[PDB]
Protein backbone atom coordinates (compact mmCIF):
# COMPACT_ATOMS: atom_id res chain seq x y z
CA UNK A 1 0.00 0.00 0.00
CA UNK A 2 1.23 3.60 -0.79
CA UNK A 3 3.01 5.91 1.63
CA UNK A 4 3.27 9.68 1.34
CA UNK A 5 5.92 11.00 -1.01
CA UNK A 6 9.43 11.08 0.38
CA UNK A 7 12.86 12.38 -0.79
CA UNK A 8 14.40 9.99 -3.31
CA UNK A 9 11.05 8.97 -4.80
CA UNK A 10 11.04 8.93 -8.64
CA UNK A 11 8.07 10.42 -10.53
CA UNK A 12 6.86 12.01 -13.67
CA UNK A 13 6.00 15.57 -12.66
CA UNK A 14 3.36 17.58 -14.48
CA UNK A 15 3.64 21.29 -15.10
CA UNK A 16 1.38 23.51 -17.24
CA UNK A 17 2.43 23.59 -20.88
CA UNK A 18 4.96 20.80 -20.44
CA UNK A 19 4.66 16.99 -20.92
CA UNK A 20 4.82 14.76 -17.82
CA UNK A 21 8.50 15.04 -17.04
CA UNK A 22 11.01 12.63 -15.38
CA UNK A 23 11.80 13.99 -11.90
CA UNK A 24 12.55 13.11 -8.29
CA UNK A 25 11.47 14.39 -4.88
CA UNK A 26 14.52 16.25 -3.55
CA UNK A 27 15.90 16.64 -0.07
CA UNK A 28 16.02 20.14 1.34
CA UNK A 29 19.63 20.95 2.32
CA UNK A 30 20.41 22.43 5.73
CA UNK A 31 20.04 26.18 5.43
CA UNK A 32 18.24 26.00 2.09
CA UNK A 33 14.83 27.49 1.13
CA UNK A 34 11.90 25.29 2.24
CA UNK A 35 8.87 24.63 -0.05
CA UNK A 36 5.42 26.15 0.77
CA UNK A 37 3.23 23.90 3.00
CA UNK A 38 1.95 20.76 1.29
CA UNK A 39 4.44 21.20 -1.58
CA UNK A 40 7.54 19.16 -2.39
CA UNK A 41 10.85 20.22 -4.01
CA UNK A 42 10.86 18.54 -7.42
CA UNK A 43 14.14 18.12 -9.31
CA UNK A 44 13.49 17.69 -13.04
CA UNK A 45 15.98 15.44 -14.77
CA UNK A 46 17.69 16.68 -17.92
CA UNK A 47 16.83 20.36 -17.30
CA UNK A 48 18.07 20.06 -13.70
CA UNK A 49 15.55 22.72 -12.64
CA UNK A 50 13.53 22.66 -9.39
CA UNK A 51 9.90 23.62 -8.91
CA UNK A 52 7.51 23.11 -6.00
CA UNK A 53 4.56 20.81 -6.65
CA UNK A 54 1.82 19.06 -4.74
CA UNK A 55 0.86 15.35 -5.14
CA UNK A 56 -1.78 16.07 -7.80
CA UNK A 57 1.06 16.73 -10.26
CA UNK A 58 3.23 13.76 -9.18
CA UNK A 59 2.86 10.35 -10.86
CA UNK A 60 5.01 7.46 -9.46
CA UNK A 61 7.67 6.52 -12.01
CA UNK A 62 7.25 2.77 -11.98
CA UNK A 63 3.47 2.77 -12.59
CA UNK A 64 3.69 5.62 -15.16
CA UNK A 65 6.80 4.94 -17.24
CA UNK A 66 4.98 2.88 -19.90
CA UNK A 67 2.79 5.92 -20.67
CA UNK A 68 5.14 8.82 -20.10
CA UNK A 69 8.70 7.57 -20.59
CA UNK A 70 9.01 7.89 -24.37
CA UNK A 71 11.28 10.40 -26.23
CA UNK A 72 10.10 13.98 -26.55
CA UNK A 73 11.19 16.91 -28.72
CA UNK A 74 11.46 19.21 -25.71
CA UNK A 75 14.83 20.45 -24.48
CA UNK A 76 16.31 18.31 -21.72
CA UNK A 77 13.70 15.58 -21.93
CA UNK A 78 15.63 12.67 -23.42
CA UNK A 79 18.62 13.48 -21.21
CA UNK A 80 16.11 13.38 -18.36
CA UNK A 81 14.90 9.93 -19.44
CA UNK A 82 18.50 8.67 -19.35
CA UNK A 83 19.08 10.11 -15.89
CA UNK A 84 15.94 8.75 -14.23
CA UNK A 85 16.62 5.29 -15.67
CA UNK A 86 20.43 5.14 -15.20
CA UNK A 87 21.46 7.35 -12.25
CA UNK A 88 18.35 8.86 -10.58
CA UNK A 89 20.04 9.40 -7.17
CA UNK A 90 23.20 11.13 -8.45
CA UNK A 91 24.30 14.67 -7.70
CA UNK A 92 23.52 16.85 -10.68
CA UNK A 93 24.99 20.06 -9.19
Swiss-Prot record:
Q: Where in the cell is it found?
A: Nucleus; Cytoplasm
Q: PWWP domain: from which residue to which, for each copy? A: 7-64
Tissue-wise expression? Widely expressed. High expression is found in heart, skeletal muscle, ovary and testis. Overexpression is frequently observed in hepatocellular carcinoma samples.
Q: What does this protein do?
A: Acts as an epigenetic regulator of myogenesis in cooperation with DPF3a (isoform 2 of DPF3/BAF45C). Associates with the BAF complex via its interaction with DPF3a and HDGFL2-DPF3a activate myogenic genes by increasing chromatin accessibility through recruitment of SMARCA4/BRG1/BAF190A (ATPase subunit of the BAF complex) to myogenic gene promoters. Promotes the repair of DNA double-strand breaks (DSBs) through the homologous recombination pathway by facilitating the recruitment of the DNA endonuclease RBBP8 to the DSBs.
What the record says about family reads: Belongs to the HDGF family.
The record's note on quaternary structure and interaction partners says:
Interacts with HDGF. Interacts with trimethylated 'Lys-36' of histone H3 (H3K36me3). Interacts with trimethylated 'Lys-79' of histone H3 (H3K79me3), but has higher affinity for H3K36me3. Interacts with IWS1. Interacts with H2AX, POGZ, RBBP8 and CBX1. Interacts with histones H3K9me3, H3K27me3 and H3K36me2. Interacts with DPF3a (isoform 2 of DPF3/BAF45C). Interacts with SMARCA4/BRG1/BAF190A, SMARCC1/BAF155 and SMARCD1/BAF60A in a DPF3a-dependent manner.
- Write down what this protein is called: Hepatoma-derived growth factor-related protein 2
Q: Which organism is it from?
A: Homo sapiens
Amino acid sequence: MPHAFKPGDLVFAKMKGYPHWPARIDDIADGAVKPPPNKYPIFFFGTHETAFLGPKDLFPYDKSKDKYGKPNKRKGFNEGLWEIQNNPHASYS
